[PDB]
PDB file of C-alpha atoms and ligand atoms in Angstrom:
ATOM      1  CA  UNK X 508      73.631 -37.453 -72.879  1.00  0.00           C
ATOM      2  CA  UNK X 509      74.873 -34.120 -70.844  1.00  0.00           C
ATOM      3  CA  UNK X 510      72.339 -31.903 -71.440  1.00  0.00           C
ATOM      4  CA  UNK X 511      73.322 -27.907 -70.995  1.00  0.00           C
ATOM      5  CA  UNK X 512      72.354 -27.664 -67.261  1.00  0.00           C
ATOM      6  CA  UNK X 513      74.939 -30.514 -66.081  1.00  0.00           C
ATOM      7  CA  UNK X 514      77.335 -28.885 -68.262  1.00  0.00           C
ATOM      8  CA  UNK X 515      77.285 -26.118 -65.874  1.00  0.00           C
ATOM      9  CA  UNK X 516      77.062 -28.265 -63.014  1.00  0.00           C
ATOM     10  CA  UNK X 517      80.180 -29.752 -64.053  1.00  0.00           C
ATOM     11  CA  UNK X 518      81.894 -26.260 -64.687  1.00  0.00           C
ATOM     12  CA  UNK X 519      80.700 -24.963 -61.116  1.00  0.00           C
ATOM     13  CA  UNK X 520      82.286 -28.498 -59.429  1.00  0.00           C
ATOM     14  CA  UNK X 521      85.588 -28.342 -61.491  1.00  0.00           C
ATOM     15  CA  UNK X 522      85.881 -24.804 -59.765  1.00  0.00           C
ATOM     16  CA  UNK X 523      85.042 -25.723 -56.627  1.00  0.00           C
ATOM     17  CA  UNK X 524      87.341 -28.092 -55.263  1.00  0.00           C
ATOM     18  CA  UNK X 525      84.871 -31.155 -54.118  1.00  0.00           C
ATOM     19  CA  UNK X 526      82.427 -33.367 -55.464  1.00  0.00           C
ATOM     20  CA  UNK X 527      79.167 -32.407 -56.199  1.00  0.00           C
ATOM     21  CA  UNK X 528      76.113 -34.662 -55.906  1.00  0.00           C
ATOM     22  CA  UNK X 529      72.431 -32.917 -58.084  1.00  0.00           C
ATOM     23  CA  UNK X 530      69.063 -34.038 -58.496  1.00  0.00           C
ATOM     24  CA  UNK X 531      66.075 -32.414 -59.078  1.00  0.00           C
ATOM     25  CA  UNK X 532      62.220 -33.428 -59.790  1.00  0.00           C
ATOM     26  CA  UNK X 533      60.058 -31.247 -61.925  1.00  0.00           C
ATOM     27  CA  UNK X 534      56.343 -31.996 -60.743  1.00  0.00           C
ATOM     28  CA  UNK X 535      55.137 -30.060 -63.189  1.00  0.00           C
ATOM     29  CA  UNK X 536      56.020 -32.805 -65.655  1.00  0.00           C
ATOM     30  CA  UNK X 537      57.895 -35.579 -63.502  1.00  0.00           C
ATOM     31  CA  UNK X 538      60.818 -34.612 -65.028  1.00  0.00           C
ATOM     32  CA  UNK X 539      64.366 -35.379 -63.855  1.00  0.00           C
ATOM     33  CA  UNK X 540      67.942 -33.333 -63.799  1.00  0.00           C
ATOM     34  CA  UNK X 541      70.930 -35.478 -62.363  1.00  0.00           C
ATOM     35  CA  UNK X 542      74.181 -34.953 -62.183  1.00  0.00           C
ATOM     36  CA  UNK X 543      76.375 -37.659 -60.172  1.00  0.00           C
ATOM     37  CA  UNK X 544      73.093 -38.698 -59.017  1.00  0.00           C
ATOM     38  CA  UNK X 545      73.866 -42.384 -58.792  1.00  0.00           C
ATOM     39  CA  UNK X 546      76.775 -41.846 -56.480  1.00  0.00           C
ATOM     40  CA  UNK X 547      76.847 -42.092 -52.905  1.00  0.00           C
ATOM     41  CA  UNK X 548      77.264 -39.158 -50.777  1.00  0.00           C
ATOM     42  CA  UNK X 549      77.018 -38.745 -46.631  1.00  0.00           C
ATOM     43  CA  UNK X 550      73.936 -37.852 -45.891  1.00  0.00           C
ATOM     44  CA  UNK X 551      74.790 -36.080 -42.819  1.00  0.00           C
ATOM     45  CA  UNK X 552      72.023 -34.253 -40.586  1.00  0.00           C
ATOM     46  CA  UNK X 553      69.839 -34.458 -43.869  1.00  0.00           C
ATOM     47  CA  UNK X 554      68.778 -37.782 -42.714  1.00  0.00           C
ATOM     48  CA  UNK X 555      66.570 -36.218 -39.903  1.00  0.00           C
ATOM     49  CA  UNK X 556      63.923 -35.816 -42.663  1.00  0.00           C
ATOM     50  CA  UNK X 557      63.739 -39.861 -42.534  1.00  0.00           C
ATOM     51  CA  UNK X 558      64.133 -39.865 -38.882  1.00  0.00           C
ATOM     52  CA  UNK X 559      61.589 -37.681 -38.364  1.00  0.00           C
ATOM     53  CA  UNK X 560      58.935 -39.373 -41.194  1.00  0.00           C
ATOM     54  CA  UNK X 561      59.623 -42.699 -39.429  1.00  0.00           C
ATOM     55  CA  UNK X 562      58.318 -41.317 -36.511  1.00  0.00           C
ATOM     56  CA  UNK X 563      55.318 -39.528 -37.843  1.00  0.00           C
ATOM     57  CA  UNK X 564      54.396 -42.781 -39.076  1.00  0.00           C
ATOM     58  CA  UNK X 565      54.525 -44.738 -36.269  1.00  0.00           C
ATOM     59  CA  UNK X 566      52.499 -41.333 -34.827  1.00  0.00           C
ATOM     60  CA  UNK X 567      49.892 -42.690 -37.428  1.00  0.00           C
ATOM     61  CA  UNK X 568      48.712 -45.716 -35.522  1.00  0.00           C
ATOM     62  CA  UNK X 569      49.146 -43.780 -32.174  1.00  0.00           C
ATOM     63  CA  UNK X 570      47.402 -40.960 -31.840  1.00  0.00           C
ATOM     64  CA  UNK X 571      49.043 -39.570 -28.522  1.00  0.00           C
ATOM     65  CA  UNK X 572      52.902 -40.471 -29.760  1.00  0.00           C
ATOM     66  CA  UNK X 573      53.762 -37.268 -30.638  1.00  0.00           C
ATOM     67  CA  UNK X 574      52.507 -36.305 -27.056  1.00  0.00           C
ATOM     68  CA  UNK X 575      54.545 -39.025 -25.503  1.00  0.00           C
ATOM     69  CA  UNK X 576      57.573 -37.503 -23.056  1.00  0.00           C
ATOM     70  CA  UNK X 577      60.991 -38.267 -23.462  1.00  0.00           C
ATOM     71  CA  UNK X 578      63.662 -38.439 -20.639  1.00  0.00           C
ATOM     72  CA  UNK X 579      66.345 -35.802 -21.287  1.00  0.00           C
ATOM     73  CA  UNK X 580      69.117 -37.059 -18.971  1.00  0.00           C
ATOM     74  CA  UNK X 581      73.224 -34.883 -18.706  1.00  0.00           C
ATOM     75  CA  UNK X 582      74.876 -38.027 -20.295  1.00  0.00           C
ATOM     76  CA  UNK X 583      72.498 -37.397 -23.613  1.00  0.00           C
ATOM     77  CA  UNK X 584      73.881 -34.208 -24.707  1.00  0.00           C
ATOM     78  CA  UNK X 585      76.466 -35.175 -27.217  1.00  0.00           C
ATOM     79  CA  UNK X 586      78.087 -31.777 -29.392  1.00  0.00           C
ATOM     80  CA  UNK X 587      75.323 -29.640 -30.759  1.00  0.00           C
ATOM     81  CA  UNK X 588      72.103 -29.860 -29.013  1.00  0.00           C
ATOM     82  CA  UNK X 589      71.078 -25.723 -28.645  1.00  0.00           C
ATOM     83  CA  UNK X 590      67.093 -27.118 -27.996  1.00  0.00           C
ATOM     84  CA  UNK X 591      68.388 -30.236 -25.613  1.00  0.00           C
ATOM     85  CA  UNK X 592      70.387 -28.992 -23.103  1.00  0.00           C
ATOM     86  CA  UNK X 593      67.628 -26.838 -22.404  1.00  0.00           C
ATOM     87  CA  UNK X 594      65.556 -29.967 -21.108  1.00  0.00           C
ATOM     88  CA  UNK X 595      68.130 -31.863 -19.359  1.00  0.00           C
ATOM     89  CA  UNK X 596      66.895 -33.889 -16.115  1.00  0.00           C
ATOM     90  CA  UNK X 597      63.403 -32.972 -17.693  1.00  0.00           C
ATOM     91  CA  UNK X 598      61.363 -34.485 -20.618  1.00  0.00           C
ATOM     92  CA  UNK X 599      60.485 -33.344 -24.313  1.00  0.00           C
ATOM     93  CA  UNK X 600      57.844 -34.333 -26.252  1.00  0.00           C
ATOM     94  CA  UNK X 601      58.420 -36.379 -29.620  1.00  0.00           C
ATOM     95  CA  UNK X 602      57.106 -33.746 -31.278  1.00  0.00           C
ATOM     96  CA  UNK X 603      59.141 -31.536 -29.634  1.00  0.00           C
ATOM     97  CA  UNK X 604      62.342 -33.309 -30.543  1.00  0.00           C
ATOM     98  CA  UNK X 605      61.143 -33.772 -34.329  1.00  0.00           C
ATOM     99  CA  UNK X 606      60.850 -30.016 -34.286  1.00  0.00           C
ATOM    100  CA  UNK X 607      64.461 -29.600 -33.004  1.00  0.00           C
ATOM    101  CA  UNK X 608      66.168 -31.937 -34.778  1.00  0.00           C
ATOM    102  CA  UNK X 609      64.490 -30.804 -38.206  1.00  0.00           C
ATOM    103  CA  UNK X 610      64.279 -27.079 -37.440  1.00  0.00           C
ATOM    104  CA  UNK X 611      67.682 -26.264 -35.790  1.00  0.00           C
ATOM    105  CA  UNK X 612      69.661 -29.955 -36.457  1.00  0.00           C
ATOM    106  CA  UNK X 613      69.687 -30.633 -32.606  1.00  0.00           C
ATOM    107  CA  UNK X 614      71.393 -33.907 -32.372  1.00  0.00           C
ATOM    108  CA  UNK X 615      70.401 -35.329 -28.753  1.00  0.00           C
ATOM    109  CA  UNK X 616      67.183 -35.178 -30.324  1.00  0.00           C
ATOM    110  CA  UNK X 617      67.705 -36.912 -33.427  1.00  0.00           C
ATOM    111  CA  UNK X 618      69.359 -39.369 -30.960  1.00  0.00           C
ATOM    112  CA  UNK X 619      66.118 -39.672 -29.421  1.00  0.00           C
ATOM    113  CA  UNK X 620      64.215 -39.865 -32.663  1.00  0.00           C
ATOM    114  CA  UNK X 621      66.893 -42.980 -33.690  1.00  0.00           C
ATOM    115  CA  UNK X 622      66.245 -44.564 -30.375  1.00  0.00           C
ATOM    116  CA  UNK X 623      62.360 -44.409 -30.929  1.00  0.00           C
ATOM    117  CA  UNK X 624      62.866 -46.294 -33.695  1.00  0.00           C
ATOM    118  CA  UNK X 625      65.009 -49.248 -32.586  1.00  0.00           C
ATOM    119  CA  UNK X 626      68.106 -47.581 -33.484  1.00  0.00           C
ATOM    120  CA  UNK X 627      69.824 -47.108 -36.993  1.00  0.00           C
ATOM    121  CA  UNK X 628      68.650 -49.816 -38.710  1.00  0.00           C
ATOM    122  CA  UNK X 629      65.237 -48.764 -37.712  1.00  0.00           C
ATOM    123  CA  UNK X 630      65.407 -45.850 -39.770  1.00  0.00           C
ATOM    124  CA  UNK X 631      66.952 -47.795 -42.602  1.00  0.00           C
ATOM    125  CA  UNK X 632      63.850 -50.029 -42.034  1.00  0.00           C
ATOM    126  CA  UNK X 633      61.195 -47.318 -42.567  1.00  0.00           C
ATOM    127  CA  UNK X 634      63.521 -45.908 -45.872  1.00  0.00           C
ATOM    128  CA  UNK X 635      62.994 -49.445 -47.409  1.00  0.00           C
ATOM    129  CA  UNK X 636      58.905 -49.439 -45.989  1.00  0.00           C
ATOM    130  CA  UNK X 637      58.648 -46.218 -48.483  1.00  0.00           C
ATOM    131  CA  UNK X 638      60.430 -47.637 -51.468  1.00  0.00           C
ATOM    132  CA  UNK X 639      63.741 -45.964 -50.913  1.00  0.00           C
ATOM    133  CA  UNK X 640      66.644 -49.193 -51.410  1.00  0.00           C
ATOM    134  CA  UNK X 641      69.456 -46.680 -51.072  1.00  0.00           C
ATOM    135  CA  UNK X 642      69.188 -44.912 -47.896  1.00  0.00           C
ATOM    136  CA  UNK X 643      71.355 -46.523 -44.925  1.00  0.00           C
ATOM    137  CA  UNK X 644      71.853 -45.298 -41.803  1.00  0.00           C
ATOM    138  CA  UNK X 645      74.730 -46.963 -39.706  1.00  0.00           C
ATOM    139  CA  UNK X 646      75.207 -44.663 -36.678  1.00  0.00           C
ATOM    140  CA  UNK X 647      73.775 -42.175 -34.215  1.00  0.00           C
ATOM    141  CA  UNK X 648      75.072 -38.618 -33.465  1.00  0.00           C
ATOM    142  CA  UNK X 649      77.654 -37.150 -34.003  1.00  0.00           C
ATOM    143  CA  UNK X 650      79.965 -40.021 -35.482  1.00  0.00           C
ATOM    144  CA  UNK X 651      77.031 -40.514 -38.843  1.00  0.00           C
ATOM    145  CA  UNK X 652      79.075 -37.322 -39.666  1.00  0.00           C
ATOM    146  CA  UNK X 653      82.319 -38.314 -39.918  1.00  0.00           C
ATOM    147  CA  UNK X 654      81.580 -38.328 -43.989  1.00  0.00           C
ATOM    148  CA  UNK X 655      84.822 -40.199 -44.813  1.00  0.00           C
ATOM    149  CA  UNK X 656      85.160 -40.391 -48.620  1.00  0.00           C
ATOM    150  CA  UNK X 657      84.524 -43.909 -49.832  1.00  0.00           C
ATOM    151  CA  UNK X 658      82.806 -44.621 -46.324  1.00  0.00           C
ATOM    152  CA  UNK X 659      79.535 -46.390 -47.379  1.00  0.00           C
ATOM    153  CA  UNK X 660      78.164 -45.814 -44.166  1.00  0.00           C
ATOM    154  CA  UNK X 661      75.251 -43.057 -43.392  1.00  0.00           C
ATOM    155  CA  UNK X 662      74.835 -42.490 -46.823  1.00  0.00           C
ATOM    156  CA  UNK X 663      72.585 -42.104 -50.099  1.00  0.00           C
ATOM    157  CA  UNK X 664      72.090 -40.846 -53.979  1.00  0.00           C
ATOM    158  CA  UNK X 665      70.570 -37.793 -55.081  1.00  0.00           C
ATOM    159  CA  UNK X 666      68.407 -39.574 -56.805  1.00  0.00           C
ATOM    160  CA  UNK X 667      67.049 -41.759 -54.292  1.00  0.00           C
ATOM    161  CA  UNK X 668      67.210 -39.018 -51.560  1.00  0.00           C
ATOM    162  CA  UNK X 669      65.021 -36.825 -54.109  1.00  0.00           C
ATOM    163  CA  UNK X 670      62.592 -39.065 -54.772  1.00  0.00           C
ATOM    164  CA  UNK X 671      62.088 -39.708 -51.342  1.00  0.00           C
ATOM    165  CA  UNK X 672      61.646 -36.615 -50.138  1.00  0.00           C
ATOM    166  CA  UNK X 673      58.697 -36.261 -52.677  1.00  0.00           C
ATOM    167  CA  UNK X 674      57.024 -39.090 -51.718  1.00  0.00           C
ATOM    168  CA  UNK X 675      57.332 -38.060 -48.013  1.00  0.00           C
ATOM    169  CA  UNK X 676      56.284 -34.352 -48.621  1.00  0.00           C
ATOM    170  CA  UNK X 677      54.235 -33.983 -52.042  1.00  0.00           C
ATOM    171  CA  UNK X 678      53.216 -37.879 -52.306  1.00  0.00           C
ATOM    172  CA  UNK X 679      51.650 -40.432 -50.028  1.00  0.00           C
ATOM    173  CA  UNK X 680      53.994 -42.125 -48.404  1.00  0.00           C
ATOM    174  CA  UNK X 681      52.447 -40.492 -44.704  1.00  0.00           C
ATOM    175  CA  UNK X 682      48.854 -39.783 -43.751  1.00  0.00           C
ATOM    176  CA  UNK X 683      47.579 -36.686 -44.746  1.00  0.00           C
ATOM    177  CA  UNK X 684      48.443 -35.086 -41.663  1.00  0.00           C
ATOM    178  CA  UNK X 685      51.408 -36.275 -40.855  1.00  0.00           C
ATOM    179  CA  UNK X 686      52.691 -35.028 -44.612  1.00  0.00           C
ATOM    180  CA  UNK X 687      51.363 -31.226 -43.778  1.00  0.00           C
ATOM    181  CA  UNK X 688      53.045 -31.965 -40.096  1.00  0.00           C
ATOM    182  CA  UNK X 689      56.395 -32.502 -42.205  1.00  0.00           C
ATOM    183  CA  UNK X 690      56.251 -29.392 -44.383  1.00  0.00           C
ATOM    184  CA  UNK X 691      55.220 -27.156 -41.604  1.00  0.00           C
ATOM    185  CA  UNK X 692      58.310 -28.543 -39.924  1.00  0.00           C
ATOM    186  CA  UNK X 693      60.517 -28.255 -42.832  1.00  0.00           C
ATOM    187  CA  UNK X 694      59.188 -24.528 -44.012  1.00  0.00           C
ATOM    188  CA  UNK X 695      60.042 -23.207 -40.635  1.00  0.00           C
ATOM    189  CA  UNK X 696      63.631 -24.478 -40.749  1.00  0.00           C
ATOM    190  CA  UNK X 697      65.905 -21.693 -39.176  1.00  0.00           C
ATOM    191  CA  UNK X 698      69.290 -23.128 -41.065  1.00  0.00           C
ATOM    192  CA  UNK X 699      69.120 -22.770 -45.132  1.00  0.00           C
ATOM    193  CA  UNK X 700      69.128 -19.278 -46.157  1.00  0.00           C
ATOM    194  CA  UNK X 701      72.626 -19.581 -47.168  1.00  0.00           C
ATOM    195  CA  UNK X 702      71.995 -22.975 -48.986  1.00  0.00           C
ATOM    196  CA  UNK X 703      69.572 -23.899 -51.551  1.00  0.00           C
ATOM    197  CA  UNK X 704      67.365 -20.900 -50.852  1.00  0.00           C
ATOM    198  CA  UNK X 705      70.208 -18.660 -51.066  1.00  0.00           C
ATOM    199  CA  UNK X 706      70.132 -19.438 -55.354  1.00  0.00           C
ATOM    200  CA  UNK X 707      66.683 -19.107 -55.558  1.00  0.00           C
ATOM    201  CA  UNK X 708      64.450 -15.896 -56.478  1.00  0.00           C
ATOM    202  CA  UNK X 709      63.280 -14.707 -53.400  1.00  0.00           C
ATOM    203  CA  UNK X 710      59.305 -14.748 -53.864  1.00  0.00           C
ATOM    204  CA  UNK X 711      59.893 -18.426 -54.136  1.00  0.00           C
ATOM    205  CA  UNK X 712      58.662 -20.490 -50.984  1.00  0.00           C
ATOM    206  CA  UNK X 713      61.350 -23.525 -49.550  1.00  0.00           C
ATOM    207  CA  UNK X 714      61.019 -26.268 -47.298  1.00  0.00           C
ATOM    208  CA  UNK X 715      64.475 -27.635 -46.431  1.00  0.00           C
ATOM    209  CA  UNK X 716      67.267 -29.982 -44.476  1.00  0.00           C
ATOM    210  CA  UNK X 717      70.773 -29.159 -44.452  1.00  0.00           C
ATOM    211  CA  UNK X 718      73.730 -31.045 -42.958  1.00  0.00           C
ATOM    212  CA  UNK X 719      77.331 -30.385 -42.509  1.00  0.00           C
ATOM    213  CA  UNK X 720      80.046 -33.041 -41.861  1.00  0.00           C
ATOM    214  CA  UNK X 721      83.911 -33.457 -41.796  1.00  0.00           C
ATOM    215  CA  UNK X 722      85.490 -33.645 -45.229  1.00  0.00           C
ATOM    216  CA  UNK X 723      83.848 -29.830 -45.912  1.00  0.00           C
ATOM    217  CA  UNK X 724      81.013 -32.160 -46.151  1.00  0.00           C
ATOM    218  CA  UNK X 725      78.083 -29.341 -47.066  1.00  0.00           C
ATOM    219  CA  UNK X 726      74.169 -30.701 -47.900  1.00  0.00           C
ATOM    220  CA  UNK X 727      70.196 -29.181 -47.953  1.00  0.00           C
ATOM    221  CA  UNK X 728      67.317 -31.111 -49.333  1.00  0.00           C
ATOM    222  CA  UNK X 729      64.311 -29.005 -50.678  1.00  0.00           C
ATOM    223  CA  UNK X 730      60.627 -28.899 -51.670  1.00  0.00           C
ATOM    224  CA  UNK X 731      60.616 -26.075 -53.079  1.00  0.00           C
ATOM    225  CA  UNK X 732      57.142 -23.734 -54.686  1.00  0.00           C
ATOM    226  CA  UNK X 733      57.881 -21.782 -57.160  1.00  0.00           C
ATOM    227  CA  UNK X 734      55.778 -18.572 -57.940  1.00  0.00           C
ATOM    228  CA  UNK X 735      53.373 -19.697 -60.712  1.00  0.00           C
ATOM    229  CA  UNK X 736      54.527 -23.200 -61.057  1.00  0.00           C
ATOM    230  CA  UNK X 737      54.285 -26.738 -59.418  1.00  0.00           C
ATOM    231  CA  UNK X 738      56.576 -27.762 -56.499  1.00  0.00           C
ATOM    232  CA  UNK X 739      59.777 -28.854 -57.563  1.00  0.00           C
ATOM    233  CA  UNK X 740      61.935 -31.389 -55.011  1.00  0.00           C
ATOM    234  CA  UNK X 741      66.043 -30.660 -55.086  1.00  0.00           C
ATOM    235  CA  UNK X 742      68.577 -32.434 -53.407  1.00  0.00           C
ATOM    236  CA  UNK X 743      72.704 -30.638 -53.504  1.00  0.00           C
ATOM    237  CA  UNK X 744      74.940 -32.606 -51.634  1.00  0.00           C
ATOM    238  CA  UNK X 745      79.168 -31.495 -51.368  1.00  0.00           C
ATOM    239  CA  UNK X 746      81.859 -33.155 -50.127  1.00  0.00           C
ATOM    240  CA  UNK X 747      85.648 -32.384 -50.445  1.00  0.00           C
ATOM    241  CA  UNK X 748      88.659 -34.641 -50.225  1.00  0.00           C
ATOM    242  CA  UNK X 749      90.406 -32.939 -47.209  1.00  0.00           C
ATOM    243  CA  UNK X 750      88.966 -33.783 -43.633  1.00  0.00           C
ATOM    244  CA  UNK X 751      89.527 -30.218 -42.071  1.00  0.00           C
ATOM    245  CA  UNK X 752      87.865 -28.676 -45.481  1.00  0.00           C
ATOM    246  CA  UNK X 753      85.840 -26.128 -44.687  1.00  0.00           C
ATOM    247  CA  UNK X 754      81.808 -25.677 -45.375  1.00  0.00           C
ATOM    248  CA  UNK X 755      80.855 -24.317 -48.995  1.00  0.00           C
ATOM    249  CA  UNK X 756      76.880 -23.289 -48.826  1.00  0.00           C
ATOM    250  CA  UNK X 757      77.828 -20.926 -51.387  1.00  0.00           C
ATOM    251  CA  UNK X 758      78.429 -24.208 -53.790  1.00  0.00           C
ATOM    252  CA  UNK X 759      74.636 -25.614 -52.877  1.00  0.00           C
ATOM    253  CA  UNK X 760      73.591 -21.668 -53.969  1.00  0.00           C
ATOM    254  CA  UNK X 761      75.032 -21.992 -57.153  1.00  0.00           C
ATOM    255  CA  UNK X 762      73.915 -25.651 -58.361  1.00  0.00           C
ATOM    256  CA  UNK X 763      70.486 -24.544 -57.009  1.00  0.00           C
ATOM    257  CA  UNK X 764      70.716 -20.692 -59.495  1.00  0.00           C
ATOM    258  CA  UNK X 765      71.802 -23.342 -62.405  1.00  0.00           C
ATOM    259  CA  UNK X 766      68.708 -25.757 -61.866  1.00  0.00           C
ATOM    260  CA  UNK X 767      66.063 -22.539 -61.446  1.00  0.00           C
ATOM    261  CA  UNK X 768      67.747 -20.840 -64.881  1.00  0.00           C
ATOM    262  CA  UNK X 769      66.877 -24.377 -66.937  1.00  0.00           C
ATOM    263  CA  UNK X 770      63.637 -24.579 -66.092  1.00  0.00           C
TER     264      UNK X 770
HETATM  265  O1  LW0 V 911      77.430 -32.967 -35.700  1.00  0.00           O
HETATM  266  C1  LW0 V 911      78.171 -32.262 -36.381  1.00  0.00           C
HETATM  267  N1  LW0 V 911      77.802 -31.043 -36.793  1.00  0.00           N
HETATM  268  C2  LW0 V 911      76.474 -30.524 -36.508  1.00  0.00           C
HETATM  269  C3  LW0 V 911      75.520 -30.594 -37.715  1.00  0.00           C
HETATM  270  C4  LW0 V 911      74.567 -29.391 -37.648  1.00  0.00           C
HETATM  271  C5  LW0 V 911      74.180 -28.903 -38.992  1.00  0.00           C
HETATM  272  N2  LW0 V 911      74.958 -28.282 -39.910  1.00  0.00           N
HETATM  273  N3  LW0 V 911      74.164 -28.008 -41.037  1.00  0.00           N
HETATM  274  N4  LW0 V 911      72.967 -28.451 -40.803  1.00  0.00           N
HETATM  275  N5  LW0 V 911      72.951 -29.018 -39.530  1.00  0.00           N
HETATM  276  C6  LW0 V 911      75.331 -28.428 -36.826  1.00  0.00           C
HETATM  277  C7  LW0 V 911      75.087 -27.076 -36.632  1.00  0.00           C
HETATM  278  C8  LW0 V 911      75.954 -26.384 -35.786  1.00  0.00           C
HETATM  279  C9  LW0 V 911      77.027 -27.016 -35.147  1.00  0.00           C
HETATM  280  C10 LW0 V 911      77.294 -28.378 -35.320  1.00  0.00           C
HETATM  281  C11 LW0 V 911      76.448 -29.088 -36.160  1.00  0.00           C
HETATM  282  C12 LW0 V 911      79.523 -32.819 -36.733  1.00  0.00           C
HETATM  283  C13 LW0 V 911      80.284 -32.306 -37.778  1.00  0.00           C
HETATM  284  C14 LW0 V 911      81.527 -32.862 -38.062  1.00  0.00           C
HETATM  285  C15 LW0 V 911      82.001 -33.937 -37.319  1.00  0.00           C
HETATM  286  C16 LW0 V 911      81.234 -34.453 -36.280  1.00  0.00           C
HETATM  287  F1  LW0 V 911      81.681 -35.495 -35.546  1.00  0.00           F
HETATM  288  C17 LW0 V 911      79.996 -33.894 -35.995  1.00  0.00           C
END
């Protein structure tokens, strides 16, 4: 069925120009809002959330991990790395580079947060620890951007990319701590105003992850509180079908007004 919200969805891609990837969780009821949420989509720097998690749990049977220092060395600095470069021929934490990478998409240190973990396929490995079948990640930074349409690689479903995210930030798929370590992180991002926040009232609080790619590839993943109601989880991911296309937050914005008006 296409239920009056992803008729809107639909009216607000046809307008657009790209392809637009929604889903949302309701945990005030477990309810569900898709639209194109079984197709894949590049993930883009959205999958530092589950670079960062993978770490966190790894911090769970090592209590000092987080504390552990990390050589920052000139050939590590790849094209974006505004917290990095700061640090090179010196060390940062693991905390320190989960913080970048989540907080202001540094991508030396979601390099480092990769190589922690073995690598790609280590994150992939954690992804499938949680439940999550879909995620893959292929590459490190930058080329896990490249966001090439039909490109399986470095990517996911809204679906499965929502229901992650709940289990990493509202659920149990992390300790205790490490879950409140996450949301801190992701509530004191410095890069989604314009995004999902941006089509949300403004008393409303927002945890997010966006990512931009080639292809006017635009993305954020949200917990989101709303005033007087449980947390809701909301994934908006955009991609277009020319590689020089340029970024549309204002499209994330307006999928994100159209979820908040159904509820
Ligand atoms: O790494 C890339 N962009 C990052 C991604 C990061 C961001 N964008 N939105 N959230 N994080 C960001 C922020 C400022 C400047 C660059 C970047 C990229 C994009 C296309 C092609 C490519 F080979 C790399």
């Amino acid at each position: 069925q296409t239920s009056a919200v992803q008729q809107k969805l639909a009216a607000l891609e046809k307008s657009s120009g790209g392809r637009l990837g929604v889903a949302l969780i309701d945990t005030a009821d477990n309810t569900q809002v898709l639209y194109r949420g079984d197709e894949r989509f590049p993930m883009c720097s959205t999958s530092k959330v589950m670079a960062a998690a993978a770490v966190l749990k790894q911090s769970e049977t090592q209590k000092q991990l987080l504390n552990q220092p990390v050589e920052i060395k000139p050939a590590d600095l790849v094209n974006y790395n505004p917290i990095a470069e700061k640090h090179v021929n010196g060390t940062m934490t693991l905390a320190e580079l989960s913080a970048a990478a989540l907080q202001y998409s540094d991508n030396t240190a979601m390099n480092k947060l990769i190589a922690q973990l073995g690598g790609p396929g280590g994150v992939t490995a954690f992804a499938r620890a949680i439940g999550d079948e879909t995620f893959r990640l292929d590459r490190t930074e930058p080329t896990l951007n490249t966001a090439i349409p039909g490109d399986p690689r470095d990517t996911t479903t809204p679906r499965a990319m929502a229901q992650t995210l709940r289990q990493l930030t509202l659920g149990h798929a992390l300790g205790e701590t490490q879950r409140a370590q996450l949301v801190t992180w992701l509530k004191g991002n410095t890069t989604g105003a314009a995004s999902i926040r941006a089509g949300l009232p403004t008393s409303w609080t927002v945890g997010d992850k966006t990512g931009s790619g080639d292809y006017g590839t635009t993305n954020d993943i949200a917990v989101i509180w709303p005033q007087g109601r449980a947390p809701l989880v909301l994934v908006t991911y955009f991609t277009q079908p020319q590689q020089n296309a340029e970024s549309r937050r204002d499209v994330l914005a307006s999928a994100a007004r159209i979820i908040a008006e159904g509820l």
